[PDB]
Amino acid sequence: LSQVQRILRERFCRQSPHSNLFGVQVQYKHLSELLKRTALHGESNSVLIIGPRGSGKTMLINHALKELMEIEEVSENVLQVHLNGLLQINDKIALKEITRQLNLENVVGDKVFGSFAENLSFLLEACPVIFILDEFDLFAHHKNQTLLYNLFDISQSAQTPIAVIGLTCRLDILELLEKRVKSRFSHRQIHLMNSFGFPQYVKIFKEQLSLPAEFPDKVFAEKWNENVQYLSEDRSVQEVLQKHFNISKNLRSLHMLLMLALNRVTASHPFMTAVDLMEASQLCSMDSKANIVHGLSVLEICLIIAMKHLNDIYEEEPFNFQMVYNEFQKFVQRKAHSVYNFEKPVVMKAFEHLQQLELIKPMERTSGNSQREYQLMKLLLDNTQIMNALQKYPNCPTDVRQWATS
Amino acid sequence: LVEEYFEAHSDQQTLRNLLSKVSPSFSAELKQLNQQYEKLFHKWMLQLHLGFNIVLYGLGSKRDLLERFRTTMLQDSIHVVINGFFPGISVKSVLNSITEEVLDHMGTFRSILDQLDWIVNKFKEDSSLELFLLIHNLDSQMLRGEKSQQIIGQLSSLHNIYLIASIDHLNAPLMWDHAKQSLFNWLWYETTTYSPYTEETSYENSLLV
Amino acid sequence: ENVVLCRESQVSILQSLFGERHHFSFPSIFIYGHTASGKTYVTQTLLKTLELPHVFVNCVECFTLRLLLEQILNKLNHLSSTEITCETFNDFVRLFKQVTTAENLKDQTVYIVLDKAEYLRDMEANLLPGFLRLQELADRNVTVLFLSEIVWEKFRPNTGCFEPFVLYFPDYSIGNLQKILSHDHPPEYSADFYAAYINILLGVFYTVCRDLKELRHLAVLNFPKYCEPVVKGEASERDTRKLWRNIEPHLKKAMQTVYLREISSSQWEKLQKDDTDPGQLKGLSAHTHVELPYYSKFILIAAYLASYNPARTDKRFFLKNSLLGPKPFPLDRLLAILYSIVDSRVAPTANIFSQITSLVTLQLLTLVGHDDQLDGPKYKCTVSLDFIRAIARTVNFDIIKYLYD
Amino acid sequence: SVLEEARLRLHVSAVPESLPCREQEFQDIYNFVESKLLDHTGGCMYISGVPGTGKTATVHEVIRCLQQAAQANDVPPFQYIEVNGMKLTEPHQVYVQILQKLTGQKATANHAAELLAKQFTTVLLVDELDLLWTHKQDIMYNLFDWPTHKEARLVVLAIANTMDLPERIMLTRMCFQPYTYSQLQQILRSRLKHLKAFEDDAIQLVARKVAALSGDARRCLDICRRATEICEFSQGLVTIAHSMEAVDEMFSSSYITAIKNSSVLEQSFLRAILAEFRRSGLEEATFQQIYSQHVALCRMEGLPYPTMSETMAVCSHLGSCRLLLVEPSRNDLLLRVRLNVSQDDVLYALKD
Amino acid sequence: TSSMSKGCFVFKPNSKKRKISLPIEDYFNKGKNEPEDSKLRFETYQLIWQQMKSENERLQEELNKNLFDNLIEFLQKSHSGFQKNLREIPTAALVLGVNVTDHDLTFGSLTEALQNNVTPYVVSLQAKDCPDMKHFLQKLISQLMDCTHYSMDSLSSWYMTVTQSPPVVVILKDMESFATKVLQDFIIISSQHLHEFPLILIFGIATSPIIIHRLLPHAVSSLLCIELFQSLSCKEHLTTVLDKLLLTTQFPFKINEKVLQVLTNIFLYHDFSVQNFIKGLQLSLLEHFYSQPLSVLCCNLPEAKRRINFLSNNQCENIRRLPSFRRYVEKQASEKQVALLTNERYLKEETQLLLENLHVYHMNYFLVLRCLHKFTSSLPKYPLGRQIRELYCTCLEKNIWDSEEYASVLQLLRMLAKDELMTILEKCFKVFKSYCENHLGSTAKRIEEFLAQFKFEVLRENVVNFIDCLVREYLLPPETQPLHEVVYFSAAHALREHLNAAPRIALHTALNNPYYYLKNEALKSNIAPDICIAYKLHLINLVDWSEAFATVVTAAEMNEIIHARFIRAVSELELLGFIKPTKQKTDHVARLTW
Ligand SMILES: Nc1ncnc2c1ncn2[C@@H]1O[C@H](COP(=O)(O)OP(=O)(O)OP(=O)(O)O)[C@@H](O)[C@H]1O
Ligand SMILES: Nc1ncnc2c1ncn2[C@@H]1O[C@H](COP(=O)(O)OP(=O)(O)OP(=O)(O)O)[C@@H](O)[C@H]1O
Ligand SMILES: [K+]
Ligand SMILES: [Mg+2]
Ligand SMILES: [Mg+2]
Ligand SMILES: [Mg+2]
């Protein structure tokens, strides 16, 4: 149905507010209490929310801010400023964004301020403000950390209530900061590590792929949820769920798998099947270098086998085109048969195509200093990738494979 | 001598200001090799105006001879004197010296190449300007760079600017090829005085005993 | 006009992922494949057919950030309907939210296809993660496509990013190539005649070439030679063996010449039009002869003996491998060799040193290291054995006697 | 209530009017300023220390008491100028500021520098000296040598974090030492003198841990307010248990709990790195060696055979969160990997 | 004034009213002989130099015409496709020589011809000001506009604005110097926009064309349509510029055999360059008009006789002391000696006769040289030389019949058949017809009589004796002629050291033999300056070296001055290219070893 696709595409792709909170109750208690304390009293605080990728940092701060804004007195008189470490790469850009988001762009006018903190103090004196700093580890790679010092200093000293929430992925975030800004940062840390096991992951699979209680057609929602409940207990589902849980505990990978699974649901196929999830798992788990080696010609495969022989005889030493061509000539003149005795320029063309795909990397990159041959290079394919991709080559000649084993 | 080659290959500096009681031995003999080279000044002044440039090679310090040259002839020109032996010298610095002092411009340029194009176009617009570039060392470690001499050669090729230079190093003909020795119309003049290096080697005495 | 052949699973997956207009698709798909596998063609025809608002941008042409962002903004403003200038990615996000809110573009998915996406990673660190997360930052229902030839593992930044859905466009096999090449028919002959021509062409060239573009260009070039027996009358359309006997030595000579671009395509067409024998010319290569002065010739011979010969054998050869590349030498060794091979007095004038540094600018030598300029003696001899042996034959000198025993 | 006023007194923004445990330093700085304000002469002073010592508070207290002295007609009236180095956008922006602080005129940097040179009763204070450094280094040397003239009649105070600063520049020197056990205890009991909100064993623990680790006052105030929050959850009196929870909530490193909570293949990758370091004996190893050990480890564990496009994702995930230190992934299979953490911490985290 | 803590000292003559400038040629009067004569000499120098420069540029624009015709044919044929209608970019690989300094002039000749025939939109780019793609494209667009962050779309917008049909042509002068990346990026960007921006590329190549394979891979060289072209040889342009600047009577200035040997050795051995040969002739002309006072007569012959009419009294005595004039009065009779020495008017008239005799000698000598060239060119095996310049040198150093090499040429010349001799006589009679105002009126009639006559051996030996007697009479060295010093230049050594110097020989001679520059008995086979004795001491641990230097300086001559002399004489030797410190010892280095 169309509405199922709409609601589930808004759930998985454009990551959307859903009521469920998974293993973050203590952390949400800490964050909600601190934000409510900043909003209703005059306390000024700093938090670093630390977690790996896709572990629910922005979900937690958006949910906490939504519940905080449900209070009417907070919603009347609390201002927010969002700043990302990707968009604002300088302190001038960030300061312009602070002036614009506080709706004081008309107020500041043509007035000139002697220092950055004079600009910020003029901003704040025209009612609490909450600062959210997405990609906090990029704000600490600036010149002298003017923004971090001037935010932590106003939080520690000035009367104006300010909360500085910073979302980061680095576990060493308290080693990039300067000593003086480390002093003014109250070391309140919220860690969203993924502390849940595999049966809880199966409940995650059930709870995300389920229609809400405000859905209009109730009988289709009921039979959809019963089909999902049945699909959670299927052993073929739990094998690929075990494989994806073994790779990572991230929920964003699960959402990618669920979107690839749900993509195969049409008017002809109303309900999800285990084969949909297995096909999605086969899509996600492809090996890229084997896919690239599958598309090569025969001559490039012979070049790669000659390179493998060079790396096996003269171990961990780079090579140029002349040694590779000498080994390939030792093939074509004696070992197998007369043809594939191609000339040097077409073999050089194949070698340059292997360089273009970045299956070969130069040992030293100096363009123009050296000619095309006599340039030392290294192979970026392991032996077992070569053997596995060679077994799956579409029409491989027998003598090339027999040369590769020997 | 490939024969000898193959075979062979197979005290503070503050004292030196006070300890300068050395007496040259051949004072009379070396006094005749300075006014010998004062004869060639008018030939140099003529050949500068016909589009040539002069490079001086020798054993001793040519700095006194160029300093004598400034006092003799160039007393009515907008001339600029460059010290290659100075530790903090750059081709960016000589370009600021020409732009800011001679032409009275007061601004900051985005790159050295844009400023070089601006000085070239300003000299091509007006031929009333005559400017002399004396460079005491052209082979020093700050000016050995190929891009700096590319800028200096593009400066020297115009018809209303002139250049005299001195080289000291043994392998100085390495640092110009056929494309760059077409920008400089060099006339090589041996001025082999025996004066010893005081100003140039005062910085050399810093990093040794 | 445009028809896609042997691309049916890929079109199915793309059209399924796009969904309806008001639906939300993936934030980022990364499409990878080989040098001609319908990356641009299938995507561009599929976005043109479904009438989806999309902007197709090449990253080689936009070599700065400002050019790329202004190209996207101007093309979107042309789709919606003077000049919008943005210097930073921040203003790009703000102006992109400004332009998308028009009545045509409020409730549909806008597509930003970026071709040759392996040039984005060289631009700046914050550009590629910003485009991977553009649906989250702008909140404007946006999908961004990345067409590339390099795999995704070479693209990941050190700090991580939002992961795209990675899709693979498979290679064309010999059956797919034969089906695609036999579609743009020459109308003056039959279908199976051109099919047999494509069959013998792929019989010759499939070992060394799997590229559809090069094979189609070769099929365009060699076709009048194939169909001149039926013009003259020696053969007919059903005489396949006569046609293949005519065409296969010509096809085995075209590989050495036109595929390597020694003889140009227009020259090849003129040779078969004028009936002149193929491979009767030198081409671009085999013109390896440069006219040098006398001392430049001995400087180059001295450098070639300095580079490819060890220093321990110097005194045995001159006073009284070819693999592994050149070996660097100092300037003093070069001058010692030069004074030892010339049987006359040579003065070390300024022009000989100017010759040594001018052979570097002609790429016949290369200085290595660049530690110092005047007191930097390091040089290499970057030229081959045949060029040096021809020069040594010109000055009447025996280079093989002095290279090795 | 009771803990609410504890949160009000314990806040860093509530600086006391009279500071405990820094009465000698106030007396020394006040006598150094009184020896130069009454006789109408000029001088320079440099102050240093680690950031928790209390320099800015004592300097502002000295300036406050001198302002009340001048208001009471004891000393001649004096203008106060304050410049902070970190708050400025550019290093030269001192010159446009001090002039604007001294006279009404606004100008460029160099022209304000010239008018400040020609101008030289004002008492300048320059906090955060380290950011006024330039490669030409005129700002530092000027800021010392203007007050040592007869026309200038200026007093310069300078604050920084390194005591060995004004020797590389080529001046009374003052050093603030970090607080000990008893001084930190005195500050914490001074803030809570009339309030029965804390047990003295908790104050004992917080003072002894902070005085052991760094020696800052802001850390004491933060740990005490966080322990107040933890005690507010368990509902009083802030016992030894709540401060013990706060001190290792704010002091412990979360590397071991990150390694323990990772997925199966990430722990197997770490075991492969350790096995490669045992076989080699170095501190770096290429991705090829680690993957060659990891295939064997996944074989004996019973896990399915790992692809390189999966092991590269595991390596990028571990290196992204700074458990490992890796090169950019643009070169691949030649990535030398080194552990960010010690091997003993890894074996402590993986054994359970 | 010349030393503070700054590396630049600008000086201005401001605040004083000396706005007037000093005119040129005041520096030419460094030796006072006559105040008026030197000005006339400088004007004669400027006039002759302008004539030689204009003749050189006319010669060079004449020679490159055929290659320009083929290239214009290629450009029109390649743009016929865009006139009809992805295609390849049409490129021409113009293989210039190794003679780099010539190329700029060639490109000037290449530009205006295209601007007259194919396109009005021609631009030239060099690699020195294109480090990256932004500078390459910014430099390209402005040269397009005169004939904001611009891109490739601005080029298409400008083209659509100005045309509303001709191509644009971009000449990249030097393939060796461009970066690989800007070439690859420019080709890839420009190829996909060929439908609305027609681009034709000429690649100026100095070496063989395989450098295209060196910079560009096969994936990018397949986007080009390369057709190869070749330019004129250096040798042919050299022989043409000597035949139209030295072997003509139109220019009065000539050079001696040794100066010509100097210039041909620095041409053939060091570098092919005709601009260096032109610079050598400019310096020869300059120093000849400097050193010689009576070189004012080296101009066109009526002006020369007009100058002979009006001279100063000292100039006549300067004429009298010429060595050729001295030998000329020695060989005459007794009364003519005092007639020439005493009276200066008879001197003026007699020198007026002698200049005209020299002028007709030059004309006869060049036409007989041109006639002998046909005989030696038709004859195989070329003993005297295959080129006119080799023949001119070997006849200029000495008469060719005194040498025994000419007898073998004559002996080979007797063994020819009829068709070759008919070809020789036709070419030589064409030579006589080509140069008008002949003073050899008899020989043209003689050779037309020999051509008219068609016992073959007797007429064959008759024509052999004819050309033999011709080169007896008129091939003659200029050193055996009166007043040749007026119009000849012989300063080989000074010209050689000004053009082609040797600094390492000078440094070695100064250090090893300081008596050569200080003739005060400083050396015959301890008494030396400090640098010259330290250099001979090392040709190297420092302490033993200092003891050896101290032993020598105390043998030759509580002070502690001599150790500072050692420090200065090692630091000075280190400022030159001799001493480099090394960590194996306190010092162990020998950078010369020669
Ligand atoms: N514990 C959880 N409870 C509910 N949803 C979760 C949880 N963990 C992850 N998610 C879901 O997974 C995704 C997590 O990514 P999110 O954007 O919230 O933060 P993030 O991706 O870690 O931040 P960043 O973009 O900086 O990496 C969201 O869609 C969220 O809905
Ligand atoms: N399935 C197909 N059906 C018809 N024509 C095709 C097909 N695939 C490719 N072509 C033709 O081959 C040409 C090259 O394909 P395309 O440009 O899509 O390759 P590409 O992968 O974009 O190349 P690159 O990797 O260089 O960007 C196209 O012009 C197209 O006309
Ligand atoms: K000049
Ligand atoms: Mg997030
Ligand atoms: Mg494409
Ligand atoms: Mg402070």
How many angstroms does the Cα of residue A95 sit away from the middle of ligand 6?
23
- Establish if E460 belongs to a structural domain: no
D and E make contact (3+ CB pairs below 8 Å): no
Structure tokens that stand for E17 in this block: 């009213």
**Inter-chain contacts counted by CB atoms under 8 A, chains C and E:** 109
Same domain as E277, residue E148: no
d(CA D110, CA D351): 65
SS3 content of chain C, % helix, strand, coil (to 5): 50, 10, 45
Residue nearest to atom 6 of ligand 2 (CA): C38
Query: Cα separation of A139 and E342, whole Å?
Result: 102
Closest ligand 1 atom to A56 CA: 18
By the 8 A CB rule, do A116 and A150 touch?
yes
Query: Quick one: closest CA in E to A350, which residue?
Result: E218
Structure-token match 């994936």, residue found: E219
Neighbours of C56 (CB within 10 A): 17
Q: Nearest Cα to B135, choosing from B33, B53, B30, B13?
A: B53
Provide long-range contacts, Cβ within 8 A and 24+ apart, for A289-292. A289/A359, A289/A381, A289/A385, A289/A389, A289/C151, A289/D308, A289/D309, A290/A385, A290/A388, A290/A389, A290/A392, A291/C168, A291/C170, A292/A357, A292/A359, A292/C34, A292/C151
Check C284 against E206: CB less than 8 A apart. no
Longest dimension (CA), chain E: 104
The CATH code of the domain at B27-190 is 3.40.50.300
Q: Quick one: which atom of ligand 1 is closest to the CA of C133?
A: 25
d(CA E133, CA C63): 8
Which CATH number fits the domain that encloses residue E175? 3.40.50.300
Q: Name the closest-CA residue to atom 4, ligand 1.
A: A21
Inter-chain touch B86–E593, beta carbons under 8 Å: no
Number of domains in chain E: 3
Contact A156 D218 (CB under 8 A): yes
Place of tokens 């001599």: E562
Q: Nearest to residue E214, comparing CAs of A303, C307, C382?
A: C382
**Residue E57, token pair as written in the block:** 């540029």
Name the 3-class secondary structure at B190. strand
Cα–Cα distance for residue pair D144/D44, rounded to 1 Å: 7
CB–CB of C171 and A294 under 8 A?
yes
Task: Give nearest CA residue, ligand 1 atom 22.
Answer: A54
Q: What are the binding residues of D for ATP? A: 15, 49-57, 128, 161, 218
Which residue shows structure tokens 């901003």?
A: A123
Please return the burial class of A378, using the count of CB atoms within 10 Å of its CB with bins 0-12, 13-18 and 19+. Answer: middle
Which residue range forms the structural domain that includes residue E522?
503-575
In a domain, E428, yes or no: no
CA distance C310 to D37: 81
Q: Which CATH class is domain C8-168?
A: alpha beta
DSSP label of C313: G
Task: Kindly list the partner chains of chain C, i.e. chains with 3 or more CB atom pairs below 8 Å.
Answer: A, B, D, E
Residue A179, C-beta contacts closer than 8 angstroms, at least 6 positions apart: D50, D51, D161
A235 is in an annotated binding site: no
E strands along E149-258, which residues? 168-172, 199-205, 224-230
- Cα of C294 from ligand 3 centre, angstroms: 31
Chain E positions touching A367 (Cβ under 8 A) are 179-181
Q: Which residues, listed in sequence order, are joined to residue A164 by a DSSP beta bridge?
A: A46, A131
Q: Residue B141 Cα, ligand 3 centroid: separation in angstroms?
A: 24
Compute the distance between CA of residue A378 and CA of residue A360 in angstroms, rounded to an integer: 6
A249 is in an annotated binding site: no
Q: Nearest ligand, CA of residue D58?
A: 6
| Inter-chain CB proximity B58 and E506 less than 8 Å | yes
Whether E39 is in a domain gets the answer: no
> Which atom of ligand 1 approaches the CA of A15 most closely?
29
Give the residue from chain E lying closest to B205, CA to CA: E571
Alpha carbon B41 to its chain centroid, in Å, reads: 16
In a domain, E169, yes or no: yes
Give a yes or no: residue E408 inside a domain.
yes
Q: What is the DSSP letter of D106?
A: -
**What is the token pair recorded at A248?**
């990572």
Under a CB-based contact definition with an 8 Å cutoff, are residues D6 and D197 in contact?
yes
Provide the shortest C-alpha distance from residue C159 to chain D (in Å).
5
Any alpha helices (H) in C101-185, and if so which ranges?
A: 127-132, 134-138, 174-181
What 3-state class would DSSP assign to D28? helix
> What spacing in Å lies between the alpha carbon of E430 and ligand 4's midpoint?
94
CA distance A275 to C239: 52
DSSP secondary structure letter of residue C247: H
Ligand 3: distance of its center to the CA of E252 in Å? 28
- Rounded to 5 degrees, φ, ψ at C128 are -65, -45
A326 CB near a chain D CB, below 8 Å? no
Q: Measure Cα distances from A146 to A84, A91, A302, B112, D86 in Å.
A: 16, 7, 58, 32, 7
C192 lines ligand 2 (CB under 6 A): no
Q: Is A85 annotated as a binding residue?
A: no
| Candidate of C133, C134, C162 to mutate for ligand 1, largest count of ligand atoms within 8 Å of Cβ | C162
Ligand 2 pocket test: pick from C11, C40, C58 the residue with the most ligand atoms within 8 Å of its Cβ.
C40
D172-175 and D43-48: which strand pairing? Answer: parallel
| Residue in the structure block whose two tokens are 């008494």 | E527
Residue E414: both structure tokens together: 């007797």
Instruction: Give the number of other CB atoms < 10 A from CB of residue E312.
Output: 13
Domains of chain D: 3-12+179-251 (1.10.8.60), 23-175 (3.40.50.300), 257-350 (1.10.10.10)
CA distance E195 to C238: 41
Q: In a 10 Å sphere around its CB, with 0-12 CB exposed, 13-18 middle and 19+ buried, how is residue C134 labelled? A: buried
Q: Which of A162, A246, A293, A381 to mutate to test the interface with D (most CBs of D within 10 A)?
A: A246
When CB atoms are compared, the residue of A256, A260, A289 closest to C151 is A289
Tokens describing residue A222: 């009921």
**φ, ψ dihedrals at D180, nearest 5°:** -95, -165
HEC string of chain A equals CHHHHHHHHHHHCCCCCCCCCCCCHHHHHHHHHHHHHHHHCCCCEEEEEECCCCCCHHHHHHHHHHHHHHCHHHHHCCEEEEEECCCCCCHHHHHHHHHHHCCCHHHHCCCCCCCHHHHHHHHHCCCCEEEEEECHHHHHHCCCCHHHHHHHHHHHCCCCCEEEEEEECCCCHHHCCCHHHHHHCCCCEEECCCCCCHHHHHHHHHHHCCCCCCCCCHHHHHHHHHHHHHHHCCHHHHHHHHHHHHHCCCHHHHHHHHHHHHCCCCCCCCCCCHHHHHHHHHHHCCCHHHHHHHCCCHHHHHHHHHHHHHHHHCCCCCECHHHHHHHHHHHHHHHCCCCCCCCHHHHHHHHHHHHHCCCEEECCCCCCCCCCCCCCEEECCCHHHHHHHHHCCCCCCHHHHHHHHC
Same domain, E70 and E195: yes
CA distance C94 to chain B (A): 30
Q: What is the DSSP letter of B83?
A: -
User: Which residue in this structure is represented by tokens 């060719």?
Assistant: E400
Instruction: Tell me how far CA of residue E83 lies from CA of B7, E80, E122, E580, in angstroms.
Output: 71, 5, 19, 66
Residue E145 lies in a domain: yes
Task: Check whether A54 is labelled as a binding-site residue.
Answer: yes
Residue E94 belongs to a domain = yes
| Ligand 2 contact, C387 CB (< 6 A) | no
Shared-domain flag, residues E284 and E218: no
How many whole angstroms separate alpha carbon E174 and alpha carbon E285?
33
Query: What is the C-alpha to C-alpha distance for residues C265 and C218, in angstroms, rounded to an integer?
Result: 9
The residues in B 93-152 lying below 8 A from E, measured between CB atoms, are 93-94, 97, 101-102, 113, 130, 150
In the block, residue with structure tokens 């296969």 = C248
Ligand 4 centre and the CA of B77: distance in Å?
69
Q: Which protein residue has the closest C-alpha to ligand 1 atom 2?
A: A22
Distances, alpha carbon E81 to alpha carbons C225, C270, E157, in Å: 23, 15, 22
Judge: E179–A371 Cβ closer than 8 Å, yes or no: no
Please answer whether residues C61 and C70 qualify as being in contact, where contact means their C-beta atoms are separated by less than 8 angstroms. Answer: no
Determine phi and psi for B187, rounding to 5 degrees: -120, 110
Phi, psi of B37 (to 5 degrees): -90, -5
What spacing in Å lies between the alpha carbon of D127 and ligand 6's midpoint?
6
Say which CATH class A2-191 falls into: alpha beta
Distance CA B97, CA A47 (A): 54
**What are the φ and ψ backbone dihedral angles of A116, each rounded to 5 degrees?**
-65, -40
A116-124 and A91-101 are packed helices; what angle lies between their axes, rounded to 10 degrees?
10
Q: How far apart are the C-alpha atoms of D46 and D130, rounded to whole Å? A: 12
List Cβ neighbours of E148 (8 Å cut-off, separation of 6 or more): E154
Asked if A368's CB is within 8 angstroms of E219's CB, the reply is no
- Taking CB atoms and a 6 Å cutoff, what residues make up the pocket around ligand 1? A 15, 20-24, 51, 53-59, 167, 251-252
Q: How far is E546 from chain C (nearest CA, A)?
A: 25
C169 CA closest ligand 2 atom index: 21
Instruction: Tell me if C166 sits within 8 A of C32, measured CB to CB.
Output: yes
